Structure formats: C-alpha cells, structure tokens
Amino acid sequence: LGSPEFMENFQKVEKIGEGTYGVVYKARNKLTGEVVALKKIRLDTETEGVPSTAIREISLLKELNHPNIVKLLDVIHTENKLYLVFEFLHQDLKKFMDASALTGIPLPLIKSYLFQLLQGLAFCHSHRVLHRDLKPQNLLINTEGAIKLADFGLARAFGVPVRTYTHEVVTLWYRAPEILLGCKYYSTAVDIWSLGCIFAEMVTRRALFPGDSEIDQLFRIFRTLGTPDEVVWPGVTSMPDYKPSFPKWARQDFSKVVPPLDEDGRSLLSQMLHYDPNKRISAKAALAHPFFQDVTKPVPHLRL
C-alpha cells in the first residue's frame, strides 16, 4: 500500500527525536505550508504488519477531543511504514526546563502547566483512556501558554524497535511502583504517579527518581519515600516482584524533596506519590486541591 499524496506534499524539515518504536520529525506541507509532527513507525511486515488491535487503539486516541491533548490529525500506512500525523507544537517540557537553568521557572507557570495537565488527564481518565508514558518530552508547550499531552502509549506496542534510540532507561524514571512490582493491569493512578514525578522535576529542575535499572528505580523510590510495608500499602508484600529481602529505608519529608515549594504544592505532590494506588489522588481530586485556588494562565518566554 502506498500513500503518494501525503508523501510528496509533506517534506521533513528536521528530526525532533527518537523513541522506542518511532522517529519523530517536523514536516511542512509543500503545497499549503502546514506544519505537523510526524511519527514514523517501521512495520515488521513479517510478524505484525499493521495490527488490527493497534489500529483500533489509535482510532480511539484519534477521537480524543480536549484542548490539553495533542490532536492526532491522520494515520497513513505507506510501504512498510505507518505515519502518525500530529498537531505541531514548538517545544517540549524537557527543553523548556533545560532552557530555564539560569532563570528558574515561575511558580505561577508551573501551577498553570500542572493544572492543564491534570485537566487533560481527568478528561482522558473519564473516557477510560490511560496515557501510560508520561515524561517531560511527551508534554508540549505553545506560545499562548498551553501545555498538552502527547505520545499516548498503546496497550500493546508494535513495529520494529528503533536501533538508534538509546534512552529507554528514562522511561523507568516515571514508572509507578505498582508497575515495577509486577501488577498486570495499570490503573489511572499510574499517570498520576508520573505527573507527580514531573511536578517535582519542574520545581527542582532535576529528575526525582532517575533509576539506572528497574531495581535501582525501585530503590531510589524507597530511599525517599521509605520501603513500603503492609501498613502503608496493604497487599504490597504479596505483589509478584516484591522481595522480603528489599532493604528497609525510612521515609524522608517532602520538605527536603522539593524545596522551596510551598505547603499547598507539597501536600498535593505527596498525595500524587502515595504508594497505594487505591489511595493515590485522582486527577479530578487533584484539580480540586487548594494549590489551584489562584491558578492563572501566564505565558512562557519561548526562544524559538
């Protein structure tokens, strides 16, 4: 199958980055002038082709309609490639945080971004959609002050892994503890954990739990939040990958974790990082938190 109209009209302007299963580019329509982001996925064609299950999941994502979610414009299968075409935004949150090294990020902007991300997540969760892969590079910002959720993860990946991608370990940094301990089905709480890690990263300008392996990821979480036990997390000791031999670290206070964040922010962050998924705050309850009583929509000073 070929899609020659799309292929000839759109020209790659630059490569944005790589991911486990796709390469991302900025492309510009030769005809109009429209710019989009393209995710190019190479298909196996021997074992998978375009899986039907994947097409149904992608179709569901394409129907997601919310201002804080990047719009999937089209899906194009051509040759042995699948291209996902997205609404283009100019910068991701990782680049913005790096660019803010000498200036810091104003608290009102951090609060606005967290509020917007929670609105996008509350919306998705209410429609039975999990993001599953929240990290700074998957959060996009525009000059008007908006931030949007991008690169939603599928329940089942497909395509040939990108050999030039070497940053897979970063995905562990935002992974909820229940996933690391072996849960089978992810709940909406996994996205709140990832967003909590990102909130701490916006405030401190350093990743909260930068593990170098799955066990190191778990131990970095334990070193800060304390090794979980049956009191703080009922049922934890029975999880598939839980080991009685885990070292027992005592919990640290959030005042040392995200200085100089205010008490409202620390309270919210602590609820987003609760060990027990059943007690972790929901996106909706988070929107209702006192931290957001004075939220506004400032604009970033983007240099592009």
Ligand SMILES: Nc1nc(Nc2ccc(S(N)(=O)=O)cc2)sc1C(=O)c1ccccc1[N+](=O)[O-]
């Ligand atoms: N829509 C959209 N816009 C982008 N622009 C952008 C422009 C500049 C930068 S940067 N490093 O700050 O200069 C980063 C992103 S990426 C993107 C995505 O939808 C996307 C995002 C993450 C992973 C995969 C995809 N993806 O599948 O297309």
